[model samples]
Target chain A: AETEEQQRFSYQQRLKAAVHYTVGCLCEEVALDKEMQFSKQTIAAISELTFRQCENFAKDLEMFARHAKRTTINTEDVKLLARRSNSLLKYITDKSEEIAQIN
Target chain B: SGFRKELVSRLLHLHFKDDKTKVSGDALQLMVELLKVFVVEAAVRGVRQAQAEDALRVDVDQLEKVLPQLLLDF
Candidate 1:
């Protein structure tokens, strides 16, 4: 059976990693910036902002789509990706509600 | 604020805050610190995640990378 914490962790991990990768890109830029002082505060701020971007995700996700080479997000892509991760893959195989939430 | 703390927390969590004992202070930079810690941890936790008796060994070579010589843990 799909546990709640397991479900939450998997969902959060996907969202978090996606946002972290986004934040990581910005962090890399800041790291390279000669004038900027990259500090813990800076990282936390960026992380929080990135989380916000994830929370209010559609616009930022669309922004990601525009900036990314793929150019668009398709339903097939969503369905496929929704089933990609370990937990999600298992959930879908078991016909879980998490599958319905994927979009 | 956020960034500095993240860096500190990662380093501190890994007990890399005082790499002066392990390596030179100057060499105690972020990436170097993470590598040393990663090597030790990976060596210790190389056990296969799926199950035991698989004889899975963590590859220090694979985990070790040639790059900016810092941490991706950032």
Candidate 2:
């Protein structure tokens, strides 16, 4: 069996590639509207930044959940995650409420 | 169109020190949505930077110019 460290490294590499692909797709959508193309280096840079941001996001979520003394991260944790951006906060709050109503 | 849920879930699991810590499905979905917003916002800002310099292609330099504010706003 692979060691835990080896498994973790494999997961990280896969996540990196997945983030890069998602960034490329989003950039293509943006280009459709702006009529601008992204240089390969730009995509690579943004992808790297995004991967790092994901780590930050994960940490924030973990802290938010732990602060509340909850082991399960719920919608409230995510709402707290979006607190930085007004629009994002509003959007996530609305979605959270909507999901609440459904359940 | 966005991050795969399983990959994101794995990422979260790796970061949480407590093995019992778990993410609710709704919470996971929201995180994915947030990830999309971050990427799209970065791309749009990069495009704006290219436009400001009248560049047809968004190079890393343009992204660098806007990176500070982008990270701050997020």
Off by over 4 Å in 2: A1-7, A100-103
Candidate fnat values, all? 0.00, 0.75
lDDT agreement of model 2 with the native: 0.84
lDDT by residue for model 1 (B9-52), tens: 23322332222212212212322222223222222222222114
Cα displacement (angstroms), candidate 2, residue A75, comes to 0.9
Highest TM-score against the true fold, candidate: 2
lDDT (tens digit, per residue) of candidate 1 on A1-103: 4698798668566555544554545444433542222344334444444344222222322333344434343222222323325554343334333333551
The TM-score of candidate 1 is 0.28
- Give the Cα lDDT of each candidate: 0.33, 0.84
What CAPRI class is candidate 2? medium
Q: Tell me the lDDT of model 2 at A27.
A: 88
Prediction 1 global C-alpha lDDT: 0.33
